[PDB]
Design a binder for this molecule. Sequence first.
Ligand code: HEC
Ligand code: HEC
Lengths: 50, 99, 108, 74, 53
Amino acid sequence: MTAAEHGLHAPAYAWSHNGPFETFDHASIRRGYQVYREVCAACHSLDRVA
Amino acid sequence: EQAARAANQGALPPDLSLIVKARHGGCDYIFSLLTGYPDEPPAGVALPPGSNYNPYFPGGSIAMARVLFDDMVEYEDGTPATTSQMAKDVTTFLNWCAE
Amino acid sequence: TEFKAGSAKKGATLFKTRCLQCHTVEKGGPHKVGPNLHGIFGRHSGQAEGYSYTDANIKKNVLWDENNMSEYLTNPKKYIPGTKMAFGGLKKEKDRNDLITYLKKACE
Amino acid sequence: DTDQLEDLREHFKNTEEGKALVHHYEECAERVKIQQQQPGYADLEHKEDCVEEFFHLQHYLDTATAPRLFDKLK
Amino acid sequence: SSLYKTFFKRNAVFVGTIFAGAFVFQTVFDTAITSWYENHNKGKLWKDVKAKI
Ligand code: HEC
Ligand code: HEC
């Protein structure tokens, strides 16, 4: 299938939660909420999160 | 759904609750997508009106346009809200939301 | 007077990247997610025909000028809490100048 | 502040592989621009696009930036 | 080991002793892993975030 149809393969960024011993970075989580609320939340629902 | 499809030129914004798990690459794909928006589609790409070119999206034609730009948010904790810094942060929140 | 004339070249692209994908500046009435803005300055808020503005935009009846435009763009949602406009806003003053400065050399 | 992914995409766009890759890409775009003017491009069903080359470029930069980017982020 | 013959003395460990240790282990082992886990992830945890707030 043409490379374009598949879509470019996303590289692997070194996430701080990747790792059998790593937890999510909650501070980063908090920031992300704000980003969602002020930028994404105008078009994206988050129906499953109470 | 109709109201939603109306406000986005026929397209329908998926609920982000499980998007990290509902895609291949997860955190990586989500992030590379939010950032992956070139300013001009590669030469020869006939792009449908109302569409935007993103290479990481299958088929190249995604209905969502670039929305993340530098400093468009004032992080309460001080952190410089660069476009890739914001991308990293939602994706981590979206990952939590899903898992 | 809280408006300085920036550049119409910076505003052209500030618009391209953050407004263009919903708004059209040329003559006529080609409405997209937002109504086409040709002759929006001096006009009231929610006038352009062929468009179905929310109850909120019409209700405020804002006379459009450089100073209201710069205060709306600060927070389109704080200005009119019921606007269907999906936009966070331009936090930096300089950017609203260059932006609105483009709208005079365009929506004219 | 200048975005960290851009700063890196720029530094890597200007390396040997970087300049070689953008060249092959630009030599393609330039080849298409011609076709578009030529007699009846609208009717050809063969139209070349430069996605393949844009991908090799983009891929390269991904490989270079990805393991680095997050050290610059908070 | 003669360390064994001091406790059980040539006998297998009895079912009661076993069960008893199961309770002790269960509680200890947890605190241990939890402690090592929380420590290894300092700064990322909510407690750590709440301090900086
Ligand atoms: C309305 C202006 C939007 C804003 C603001 C954001 N998104 Fe969006 N998103 C929107 C549409 C119209 C679509 C559908 C496009 C399609 O062709 O299907 C989307 C889609 C996404 C997706 C999933 C895309 C896919 O892989 O199929 C993601 C991953 C996504 N959007 C994420 C996202 C985030 C995190 C946002 C805030 C930073 C965000 N979107 C804002 C419309 C809009
Ligand atoms: C689509 C996601 C948009 C983007 C990005 C921009 N605008 Fe918008 N705008 C949009 C909608 C859906 C509406 C209607 C809201 C309503 O209350 O009915 C609007 C409205 C405006 C208005 C009011 C028009 C009037 O006649 O009173 C203004 C002044 C306006 N928008 C300006 C504007 C500019 C120049 C933008 C970039 C900073 C911009 N909008 C982007 C949808 C969208």
